[PDB]
């Protein structure tokens, strides 16, 4: 009598779970493993026009309360992910998202021109990353509203399909309002993924009296338990301000209960990063089971019964 | 063989610990209790020109990983805190900071003009709050760099003493650079307190399917375990970029080990919020004991030996 089914953008998803871009989605082996998993969908590693080796190691550290990273967009390059979407992915198993993270507006425009035909033919869906906080000297496009509007205009001009945007967290209603106003100008922006990491935290190991990652003097994006209330805030803020769009939640999901909170805040899909990095794709079997358990105890049969229904006081 | 003594701003402090502004420092009884505690200093509740009731309750909630609040600047008004500084505080016991949070430039200018004489005569030190994330309709001043420059210019023009600024967290090196550039233009800003809460998080209780505080649809500032890596990042970022100024740490301190991390990142004083709210002023006896224990095990005698000495890779 229950279902985790999600229906959006002319697709049916068996459940709302997928990986967060960047986690377990860089290589062919990883993409196949995600496709064979119990997840409802998957997204490929944020790509640049050419391959990148990324930042020096160590560049990721798991922590009691989450994780810190400065990966620096290590990826196989756009051609590789385009080929996976065009020729290898089994769409009969689940829908596929492709994450794009060009290092300039022109880079994104040029990749989008080429992605267009594959989206048309095969149905891959674009998630445009406006938020990488780890490439040295590169600005957070989404923290620059003028730049964001220009980039979405440029992409919209050449990309004849719906797409979504991956956003960094905001921390002020003025910013939520400004960002929402811009996103609402673009009807092709049909979903907003909240959130990328909390940027530029600094973890210090008391025992070693040192930072724990090599790039950028130890500063890196935070994920995991640290970020859940910030993620819920951003999911709900955009759920409220962009009623014409769907929200994908990302941040702090370890359990079915955490997923329940994402959906209550407004999420349609729920992405899993840090927890997936630590547990592997088997996590999706556990999460679907747990979310159904939470729903059964609460007497909910479907996600639409409580999506966005968080009660205020 | 050891000492927690700190010497700064023409004052001597027995140890680096003090309350965070807003926590246990609103009433006469609270200010006396802080003065009688083992803390090295104390700061009075951020004040407005007149008494203020603050936001509707519930407006604070303790959490497993910290706290969320939207107090809304409940305070007894500037006259009350000025009178405490001028007539009641025992400067023989410890130095006193007064936190100011006018709701406009004019309000801060007018309060500073009156504060000047008491600072001259009694030695109270101003901590100017540029970061409160809980007043409905009024965004963080320090998230508007032009507003920040104009507030600091006004205060510097009318206030004939050194002072400090309480800052919200930043999450991007471009913002650390921009904020530091502005702060460095004001020689009277002799200390920077990093950080105020991580603004506008949203805590949802899975059991009640609701938010946990009443104001602003449940959106409120995060404190406690959630914010420690963000606090360390901000402390260190400004320690590096504002070499002519002192950094005061605030965020996620529950133990002597946490305090040790603040100091390693660059902190001179260490402020305690959520943990003090939950434990009461007796916490300062525990924190001084724990910090000395950490230093003993590490064979450090003084704070100067490791302040700002966090090792990078
Ligand atoms: C190792 C690692 C690599 C990541 N790579 C990407 C990326 O390529 N693109 C992206 O949009 N986000 C990336 N992220 C951010 C995640 O997608 C996610 O937004 C963040 O980790 C928060 O989710 P979590 O709390 O589930 O980890 C990465 C995160 C981690 C830990
Ligand atoms: C109940 C409460 C009241 C606060 N009031 C103030 C305030 O009046 N002025 C201010 O600058 N910060 C205020 N803060 C923020 C704290 O000073 C501190 O920056 C923040 O809680 C992070 O420290 P923590 O992790 O030790 O809680 C308040 C925090 C709490 C929880
Ligand atoms: C808008 S998408 N333009 C853009 C993309 C990426 C960068 N970057 O180098 O971070 C800048 C501008
Ligand atoms: C700076 S001196 N004054 C000030 C205080 C508060 C605001 N505000 O936005 O509420 C603006 C300027």
XYZ file of C-alpha atoms and ligand atoms in Angstrom:
712
model
C 0.000 0.000 0.000
C 3.071 2.268 -0.011
C 5.264 3.755 -2.714
C 8.450 5.771 -2.951
C 7.745 6.628 -6.597
C 8.585 10.131 -7.830
C 7.322 11.539 -11.132
C 9.059 14.543 -12.672
C 10.286 15.890 -16.042
C 8.564 13.189 -18.105
C 10.233 10.466 -16.030
C 9.296 7.936 -13.364
C 11.695 7.223 -10.507
C 11.345 4.131 -8.335
C 12.444 6.101 -5.256
C 13.843 9.574 -4.559
C 17.416 8.500 -3.787
C 20.493 9.181 -5.899
C 24.153 9.931 -5.330
C 25.329 13.497 -4.838
C 27.421 14.676 -7.778
C 31.072 13.925 -7.130
C 30.498 10.872 -4.948
C 30.920 7.424 -6.500
C 30.291 8.599 -10.071
C 33.622 9.408 -11.709
C 34.600 6.154 -13.423
C 32.760 3.678 -15.633
C 32.875 1.140 -12.803
C 31.255 3.636 -10.425
C 28.546 4.681 -12.880
C 27.672 1.042 -13.545
C 27.633 0.335 -9.789
C 25.244 3.266 -9.254
C 23.023 2.009 -12.082
C 22.971 -1.507 -10.591
C 22.206 -0.128 -7.106
C 18.771 0.283 -5.529
C 18.925 4.059 -6.094
C 16.120 5.785 -8.000
C 18.638 7.677 -10.143
C 22.261 8.772 -10.430
C 24.285 11.786 -11.500
C 27.705 11.724 -13.148
C 30.745 13.542 -11.680
C 30.739 17.289 -12.378
C 32.695 17.621 -15.599
C 34.966 20.099 -17.320
C 35.585 20.201 -21.075
C 38.810 18.199 -20.681
C 40.000 15.714 -18.063
C 41.323 17.108 -14.764
C 43.456 15.321 -12.188
C 42.131 17.565 -9.397
C 43.837 18.914 -6.269
C 46.795 17.326 -4.433
C 46.106 14.592 -1.850
C 45.015 14.151 0.874
C 41.933 16.005 -0.390
C 39.133 14.213 1.487
C 38.737 13.351 5.158
C 35.843 11.515 6.813
C 34.939 12.887 10.244
C 32.754 11.907 13.195
C 30.233 14.586 12.170
C 30.628 14.388 8.387
C 33.455 15.141 5.962
C 35.725 17.843 4.589
C 37.041 17.949 1.036
C 38.852 19.964 -1.572
C 38.714 17.537 -4.513
C 39.201 20.247 -7.157
C 36.977 18.707 -9.855
C 38.957 15.574 -10.676
C 36.977 14.188 -13.622
C 37.320 12.276 -16.882
C 36.195 15.201 -19.048
C 32.913 16.007 -20.786
C 33.466 13.660 -23.721
C 33.649 10.715 -21.331
C 30.393 11.499 -19.511
C 28.660 12.396 -22.783
C 29.675 8.998 -24.184
C 28.368 7.244 -21.093
C 24.993 9.012 -21.480
C 24.856 8.461 -25.240
C 26.100 4.886 -25.604
C 26.407 3.016 -22.311
C 23.784 3.985 -19.764
C 20.849 1.622 -19.356
C 17.882 4.002 -19.234
C 15.688 0.927 -18.828
C 17.099 0.675 -15.309
C 16.793 4.328 -14.190
C 17.028 7.929 -15.447
C 20.439 9.617 -15.628
C 21.574 13.109 -14.709
C 24.813 14.618 -16.046
C 26.509 17.225 -13.813
C 28.380 19.983 -15.636
C 30.924 22.316 -14.062
C 32.709 24.382 -16.715
C 35.320 26.824 -15.403
C 33.920 29.673 -17.502
C 30.598 30.682 -19.019
C 31.935 29.852 -22.489
C 32.974 26.365 -21.343
C 29.441 25.617 -20.165
C 27.887 27.051 -23.332
C 30.108 24.891 -25.554
C 29.435 21.709 -23.595
C 25.694 22.425 -23.612
C 25.638 22.810 -27.405
C 26.988 19.257 -27.646
C 24.865 17.806 -24.840
C 21.665 19.009 -26.546
C 21.487 16.175 -29.093
C 22.138 13.475 -26.489
C 19.478 14.868 -24.149
C 17.045 14.788 -27.091
C 17.958 11.269 -28.239
C 18.538 9.471 -24.933
C 16.884 11.584 -22.218
C 19.865 12.421 -19.973
C 19.073 15.459 -17.790
C 21.494 18.333 -17.103
C 22.365 19.421 -13.547
C 24.397 22.629 -13.997
C 26.808 23.205 -11.112
C 26.866 26.873 -10.108
C 28.658 26.164 -6.752
C 32.052 24.381 -6.628
C 33.849 25.709 -3.535
C 37.193 23.928 -4.026
C 38.948 25.067 -7.223
C 41.651 27.584 -6.190
C 41.064 31.129 -7.465
C 37.617 30.323 -8.876
C 34.575 32.261 -7.602
C 31.278 30.754 -6.473
C 29.191 31.794 -9.474
C 26.010 31.503 -7.405
C 27.384 33.983 -4.866
C 27.623 36.528 -7.711
C 24.047 37.259 -8.786
C 24.920 39.281 -11.901
C 27.197 36.482 -13.110
C 24.545 33.843 -12.381
C 21.903 35.644 -14.457
C 24.326 36.054 -17.369
C 25.364 32.361 -17.264
C 21.754 31.091 -17.161
C 20.902 33.391 -20.071
C 23.874 32.081 -22.075
C 23.041 28.431 -21.347
C 19.318 28.926 -22.007
C 20.114 30.388 -25.448
C 21.885 27.224 -26.627
C 20.278 24.442 -24.605
C 16.782 23.478 -25.803
C 15.812 21.402 -22.754
C 14.791 21.652 -19.134
C 17.682 21.483 -16.681
C 18.483 22.002 -13.019
C 21.039 24.004 -11.050
C 23.175 22.872 -8.114
C 23.394 25.719 -5.602
C 25.669 26.619 -2.715
C 23.949 27.326 0.603
C 22.729 30.831 1.426
C 22.453 32.186 4.966
C 20.196 35.247 4.722
C 16.614 35.862 3.501
C 17.858 38.722 1.296
C 20.043 36.215 -0.554
C 17.305 33.594 -0.734
C 15.060 36.275 -2.269
C 17.662 37.538 -4.762
C 18.650 34.057 -5.888
C 15.027 32.935 -6.238
C 14.119 36.022 -8.279
C 16.912 35.223 -10.724
C 16.078 31.521 -10.985
C 12.391 32.331 -11.526
C 13.390 34.299 -14.650
C 14.394 31.036 -16.345
C 11.595 28.629 -17.166
C 14.112 26.046 -18.371
C 15.456 25.840 -14.792
C 12.983 23.196 -13.631
C 14.808 21.974 -10.525
C 17.155 23.407 -7.910
C 19.520 21.150 -5.977
C 20.149 22.431 -2.426
C 22.929 22.169 -1.346
C 26.535 21.861 -2.360
C 28.923 21.766 0.600
C 29.128 24.418 3.285
C 32.153 26.128 1.757
C 35.604 26.601 3.186
C 35.372 25.126 6.639
C 38.638 24.321 8.391
C 39.085 21.071 10.272
C 42.011 20.938 12.710
C 43.136 17.654 14.299
C 43.958 18.378 17.942
C 46.334 15.408 18.126
C 48.476 16.406 15.138
C 47.948 20.165 15.617
C 47.427 20.367 11.867
C 44.796 20.680 9.176
C 43.602 17.414 7.579
C 43.576 18.165 3.842
C 46.393 19.475 1.655
C 44.814 21.971 -0.751
C 44.122 25.614 0.152
C 45.782 25.565 3.582
C 43.274 22.959 4.809
C 40.113 24.873 3.877
C 37.444 22.772 2.214
C 33.762 22.025 1.788
C 31.866 20.492 4.687
C 29.390 17.641 4.257
C 27.450 15.245 6.469
C 25.871 15.848 9.873
C 27.331 19.367 9.983
C 25.165 20.527 7.099
C 21.682 19.107 7.652
C 19.930 22.171 9.137
C 21.552 24.388 6.491
C 20.398 21.993 3.775
C 16.849 21.861 5.152
C 16.786 25.682 5.284
C 17.848 26.031 1.673
C 15.507 23.293 0.449
C 12.569 24.938 2.177
C 13.520 28.509 1.288
C 13.607 27.669 -2.415
C 10.593 25.369 -2.170
C 8.640 28.401 -0.930
C 10.130 31.006 -3.286
C 10.161 28.971 -6.507
C 6.715 27.325 -6.587
C 7.135 26.615 -10.315
C 10.170 24.401 -9.776
C 11.092 21.163 -8.021
C 13.750 21.029 -5.308
C 16.323 18.214 -4.983
C 17.706 17.877 -1.456
C 21.380 17.261 -0.790
C 23.182 17.402 2.546
C 23.368 15.365 5.733
C 21.413 12.282 4.652
C 22.490 9.145 6.537
C 19.131 7.575 7.330
C 15.570 7.202 6.124
C 14.616 9.677 8.854
C 17.011 12.281 7.409
C 15.455 11.662 3.991
C 11.997 12.114 5.500
C 13.120 15.541 6.746
C 14.368 16.519 3.271
C 11.022 15.626 1.772
C 9.077 17.396 4.539
C 11.127 20.517 3.753
C 10.158 20.236 0.081
C 12.510 17.788 -1.654
C 11.467 15.703 -4.659
C 14.743 13.779 -5.049
C 17.200 13.182 -2.188
C 20.938 13.025 -2.914
C 23.446 11.208 -0.705
C 27.119 12.265 -0.534
C 29.264 11.709 2.556
C 27.220 8.736 3.780
C 27.493 7.058 0.355
C 31.246 7.716 0.251
C 31.602 5.883 3.564
C 29.186 2.990 2.951
C 29.105 2.313 -0.801
C 26.081 1.854 -3.094
C 24.574 -0.783 -0.778
C 23.398 2.229 1.241
C 20.439 2.673 -1.135
C 18.893 -0.656 -0.083
C 19.110 0.497 3.530
C 17.766 3.994 2.842
C 14.737 2.818 0.842
C 13.958 0.308 3.607
C 14.357 2.920 6.360
C 12.288 5.581 4.578
C 9.471 3.078 4.058
C 9.760 2.171 7.760
C 9.514 5.826 8.780
C 6.532 6.292 6.479
C 4.787 3.167 7.790
C 5.179 4.272 11.420
C 3.794 7.695 10.457
C 0.968 6.257 8.351
C 2.069 7.815 5.037
C 1.696 5.804 1.833
C 3.328 8.197 -0.650
C 5.826 11.055 -0.671
C 3.299 13.574 -2.020
C 1.303 13.268 1.198
C 3.968 15.138 3.146
C 6.335 16.803 0.642
C 6.790 20.434 1.677
C 4.317 20.062 4.557
C 6.651 20.977 7.427
C 4.558 22.688 10.098
C 5.494 26.164 11.332
C 4.626 27.558 14.778
C 54.930 25.999 35.187
C 51.838 26.959 33.167
C 49.679 30.025 32.549
C 46.482 30.833 30.682
C 47.209 34.566 30.977
C 46.378 36.774 27.985
C 47.624 40.345 27.560
C 45.858 42.572 25.039
C 44.058 45.904 24.593
C 46.068 47.383 27.477
C 44.546 44.760 29.788
C 45.526 41.525 31.516
C 43.204 38.516 31.459
C 43.537 35.535 33.808
C 42.523 33.193 30.980
C 41.100 33.520 27.448
C 37.532 32.452 28.282
C 34.460 34.661 28.253
C 30.783 34.309 27.420
C 29.556 34.823 23.873
C 27.461 37.964 23.567
C 23.816 37.132 24.121
C 24.432 34.169 26.420
C 23.990 34.618 30.183
C 24.636 38.358 30.094
C 21.301 40.169 29.822
C 20.296 40.786 33.456
C 22.133 42.268 36.432
C 22.153 38.808 38.043
C 23.717 37.286 34.931
C 26.381 39.979 34.627
C 27.272 39.567 38.303
C 27.387 35.766 37.904
C 29.744 36.123 34.925
C 31.954 38.496 36.904
C 32.048 36.057 39.836
C 32.837 33.099 37.530
C 36.255 31.725 36.594
C 36.032 33.399 33.176
C 38.810 35.744 32.058
C 36.285 38.318 30.851
C 32.622 38.863 29.960
C 30.591 40.765 27.368
C 27.141 42.265 27.930
C 24.101 41.357 25.784
C 24.051 43.121 22.399
C 22.077 46.281 23.068
C 19.712 48.615 21.246
C 19.040 52.244 22.290
C 15.865 51.196 24.110
C 14.747 48.032 25.866
C 13.524 45.336 23.515
C 11.320 42.299 24.216
C 12.689 40.286 21.294
C 10.947 37.649 19.190
C 8.013 35.377 20.130
C 8.727 32.137 22.023
C 9.830 29.427 21.646
C 12.901 31.179 20.234
C 15.730 28.897 21.417
C 16.151 25.128 21.215
C 19.049 23.018 22.467
C 19.958 20.166 20.117
C 22.142 17.057 20.210
C 24.679 18.843 17.975
C 24.262 22.406 19.222
C 21.446 24.936 19.234
C 19.143 26.976 17.032
C 17.802 30.395 17.979
C 16.005 33.470 16.823
C 16.136 35.577 19.998
C 15.572 38.899 18.187
C 17.833 41.046 20.386
C 15.891 40.887 23.648
C 17.818 43.313 25.840
C 17.452 45.846 28.628
C 18.537 48.793 26.449
C 21.777 50.754 26.154
C 21.231 52.848 29.293
C 21.148 49.680 31.393
C 24.390 48.254 30.025
C 26.102 51.650 30.140
C 25.091 51.991 33.818
C 26.473 48.526 34.580
C 29.794 49.465 32.924
C 29.926 52.898 34.558
C 28.783 52.206 38.108
C 28.514 48.505 38.940
C 31.139 46.380 37.225
C 34.123 45.397 39.341
C 37.058 46.063 37.007
C 39.267 44.746 39.802
C 37.889 41.279 39.058
C 38.156 41.288 35.238
C 37.859 43.470 32.130
C 34.434 44.130 30.595
C 33.268 44.247 26.979
C 29.976 45.873 25.972
C 28.227 44.539 22.851
C 26.308 47.017 20.729
C 23.752 46.169 18.050
C 21.852 49.277 16.938
C 19.295 48.689 14.203
C 20.629 51.567 12.092
C 23.803 53.593 11.599
C 22.266 56.503 13.497
C 21.477 54.259 16.479
C 25.055 53.041 16.720
C 26.450 56.552 16.247
C 24.304 57.906 19.083
C 25.160 55.093 21.489
C 28.884 55.333 20.692
C 28.875 59.056 21.442
C 27.623 58.306 24.958
C 29.821 55.229 25.447
C 32.988 57.234 24.777
C 33.183 58.849 28.227
C 32.556 55.594 30.102
C 35.240 53.797 28.064
C 37.624 56.664 28.844
C 36.861 56.708 32.576
C 36.216 53.037 33.357
C 37.847 51.023 30.564
C 34.874 49.138 29.141
C 35.666 47.877 25.611
C 33.201 48.022 22.694
C 32.359 44.916 20.632
C 30.288 46.211 17.697
C 27.841 43.587 16.421
C 27.693 43.618 12.620
C 26.120 40.134 12.323
C 22.789 39.439 14.124
C 20.877 37.005 11.904
C 17.523 37.050 13.737
C 15.868 40.452 13.366
C 12.991 39.986 10.911
C 13.465 42.018 7.728
C 17.011 43.130 8.574
C 19.821 41.129 6.916
C 23.340 40.742 8.364
C 25.112 44.119 7.940
C 28.436 42.347 7.362
C 26.934 40.531 4.367
C 26.581 43.929 2.684
C 30.134 45.198 2.254
C 29.007 48.755 1.487
C 26.823 48.877 4.607
C 29.737 47.461 6.595
C 32.167 50.106 5.347
C 29.695 52.908 6.010
C 28.904 51.569 9.653
C 32.684 51.352 10.405
C 33.320 54.816 8.969
C 30.553 56.307 11.120
C 31.638 54.603 14.328
C 35.289 55.457 13.666
C 34.339 59.093 13.073
C 32.495 59.528 16.381
C 34.089 56.988 18.745
C 37.516 57.995 20.106
C 38.727 54.512 21.101
C 39.806 51.179 19.726
C 36.960 48.676 19.388
C 36.198 45.253 17.954
C 33.650 43.823 15.538
C 31.567 40.645 15.856
C 31.421 39.048 12.419
C 29.130 36.561 10.703
C 30.794 33.588 9.038
C 31.998 33.756 5.437
C 32.320 30.744 3.154
C 34.363 31.930 0.173
C 37.948 33.250 -0.053
C 36.686 36.191 -2.148
C 34.556 37.208 0.827
C 37.346 36.676 3.350
C 39.507 38.933 1.168
C 36.834 41.620 0.709
C 35.916 41.742 4.407
C 39.572 41.812 5.492
C 40.358 44.609 3.032
C 37.586 46.718 4.568
C 38.541 45.921 8.176
C 42.178 46.771 7.465
C 41.155 50.305 6.433
C 40.043 50.996 10.012
C 42.925 51.224 12.506
C 40.501 51.549 15.447
C 39.220 48.012 14.789
C 41.714 46.200 17.012
C 39.901 42.869 17.360
C 37.602 40.741 15.221
C 35.297 38.180 16.821
C 34.704 35.170 14.571
C 31.919 34.008 14.517
C 28.298 34.833 15.173
C 25.882 31.983 14.408
C 25.651 30.252 11.054
C 22.558 32.145 9.946
C 19.150 30.883 8.986
C 19.458 27.150 9.428
C 16.203 25.200 9.709
C 15.797 22.483 12.313
C 12.891 20.089 11.720
C 11.744 17.645 14.422
C 10.931 14.344 12.692
C 8.598 13.328 15.523
C 6.402 16.441 15.373
C 6.904 17.071 11.638
C 7.438 20.707 12.536
C 10.050 23.386 13.010
C 11.272 23.973 16.573
C 11.280 27.759 16.983
C 8.448 30.202 16.330
C 9.991 33.283 14.630
C 10.698 33.437 10.891
C 9.004 30.138 10.008
C 11.546 28.231 12.097
C 14.684 29.694 10.495
C 17.328 30.584 13.075
C 21.037 30.881 13.839
C 22.987 27.678 14.432
C 25.484 27.320 17.275
C 27.421 24.496 18.930
C 29.010 21.406 17.388
C 27.536 22.331 14.001
C 29.710 25.425 13.655
C 33.185 24.492 14.867
C 34.940 23.972 11.482
C 33.286 27.155 10.150
C 34.427 29.061 13.237
C 37.997 27.754 12.950
C 38.042 28.689 9.245
C 36.943 32.242 9.958
C 39.306 32.671 12.909
C 42.235 31.511 10.818
C 41.213 33.347 7.643
C 41.138 36.689 9.468
C 44.171 35.836 11.587
C 46.105 35.528 8.325
C 44.557 38.480 6.508
C 44.424 40.997 9.368
C 47.899 40.657 10.907
C 47.574 44.043 12.627
C 44.509 42.915 14.589
C 43.578 40.395 17.305
C 41.111 37.590 16.621
C 38.603 36.446 19.258
C 37.171 32.983 18.646
C 33.529 32.088 19.073
C 31.725 28.915 17.991
C 31.515 25.264 19.017
C 33.485 25.422 22.282
C 32.415 22.719 24.742
C 35.789 21.510 25.997
C 39.336 22.589 26.674
C 40.303 20.675 23.525
C 37.891 22.792 21.444
C 39.429 25.908 23.010
C 42.888 24.620 22.159
C 41.765 24.403 18.511
C 40.520 28.011 18.545
C 43.869 29.185 19.832
C 45.821 27.035 17.364
C 43.758 28.698 14.595
C 44.708 32.154 15.895
C 42.326 33.093 18.724
C 43.412 35.393 21.564
C 40.160 35.178 23.554
C 37.702 32.271 23.337
C 33.977 32.890 23.721
C 31.466 30.252 24.832
C 27.784 30.332 23.796
C 25.637 27.213 23.472
C 27.731 25.202 25.943
C 27.452 27.980 28.554
C 23.706 28.315 27.920
C 23.361 24.627 28.754
C 25.802 24.369 31.675
C 25.856 27.770 33.399
C 28.876 29.857 34.484
C 30.403 26.909 36.360
C 31.566 25.837 32.904
C 34.506 28.248 33.129
C 36.081 26.306 36.001
C 35.825 23.154 33.862
C 37.161 24.824 30.713
C 40.221 26.368 32.392
C 40.990 23.000 34.006
C 40.561 21.121 30.726
C 42.627 23.601 28.687
C 45.457 23.360 31.214
C 45.170 19.554 31.038
C 45.416 19.619 27.248
C 48.433 21.933 27.430
C 50.092 19.771 30.106
C 49.720 16.592 28.033
C 51.132 18.489 25.038
C 53.941 20.111 27.048
C 52.848 23.714 26.409
C 53.253 26.237 29.218
C 51.626 29.315 27.674
C 49.140 30.209 24.934
C 51.756 32.222 22.977
C 53.585 28.953 22.277
C 50.911 27.694 19.904
C 48.537 30.564 19.060
C 48.050 30.624 15.277
C 50.549 27.797 14.794
C 48.178 25.324 13.105
C 50.280 23.244 10.691
C 49.340 23.099 6.998
C 50.187 20.199 4.678
C 34.357 13.872 -2.278
C 33.259 14.801 -2.731
C 33.190 15.184 -4.065
C 32.175 16.039 -4.481
N 32.108 16.430 -5.772
C 31.100 17.221 -6.204
C 30.923 17.604 -7.620
O 31.680 17.142 -8.496
N 29.882 18.390 -7.942
C 29.018 18.863 -7.032
O 28.057 19.575 -7.406
N 29.119 18.576 -5.717
C 30.114 17.795 -5.261
N 30.203 17.460 -3.908
C 29.211 17.983 -2.967
C 28.121 16.943 -2.802
O 27.472 16.806 -4.069
C 27.109 17.403 -1.770
O 26.532 18.621 -2.254
C 27.738 17.647 -0.400
O 28.726 16.644 -0.112
C 26.659 17.627 0.682
O 26.020 16.351 0.801
P 26.396 15.319 1.992
O 26.162 16.039 3.291
O 25.473 14.183 1.653
O 27.866 14.997 1.792
C 31.200 16.564 -3.487
C 31.270 16.189 -2.153
C 32.283 15.332 -1.742
C 32.371 14.940 -0.291
C 20.515 32.513 22.837
C 21.602 33.207 22.058
C 21.696 34.590 22.088
C 22.700 35.215 21.361
N 22.763 36.563 21.356
C 23.773 37.194 20.722
C 23.933 38.658 20.778
O 23.160 39.332 21.498
N 24.974 39.197 20.129
C 25.830 38.470 19.392
O 26.783 39.042 18.815
N 25.729 37.130 19.266
C 24.752 36.456 19.897
N 24.656 35.064 19.817
C 25.648 34.325 19.045
C 26.729 33.873 20.010
O 27.381 35.034 20.546
C 27.752 33.030 19.260
O 28.327 33.841 18.229
C 27.151 31.782 18.622
O 26.164 31.199 19.486
C 28.231 30.740 18.305
O 28.864 30.255 19.495
P 28.503 28.819 20.167
O 28.719 27.810 19.080
O 29.416 28.826 21.359
O 27.036 28.877 20.554
C 23.664 34.409 20.564
C 23.577 33.026 20.535
C 22.576 32.406 21.269
C 22.464 30.910 21.224
C 28.776 31.178 -15.428
S 28.268 29.595 -15.514
N 30.142 31.522 -15.674
C 31.226 30.995 -14.904
C 31.408 29.626 -14.699
C 32.475 29.172 -13.937
C 33.355 30.095 -13.395
N 34.456 29.669 -12.584
O 35.664 29.759 -13.038
O 34.260 29.302 -11.431
C 33.194 31.458 -13.591
C 32.125 31.904 -14.356
C 26.115 50.470 11.389
S 27.048 51.476 12.345
N 24.695 50.569 11.580
C 23.685 49.671 11.091
C 23.028 48.796 11.953
C 22.029 47.952 11.498
C 21.668 47.995 10.162
N 20.644 47.108 9.697
O 20.663 46.690 8.546
O 19.695 46.729 10.498
C 22.293 48.869 9.281
C 23.297 49.708 9.753
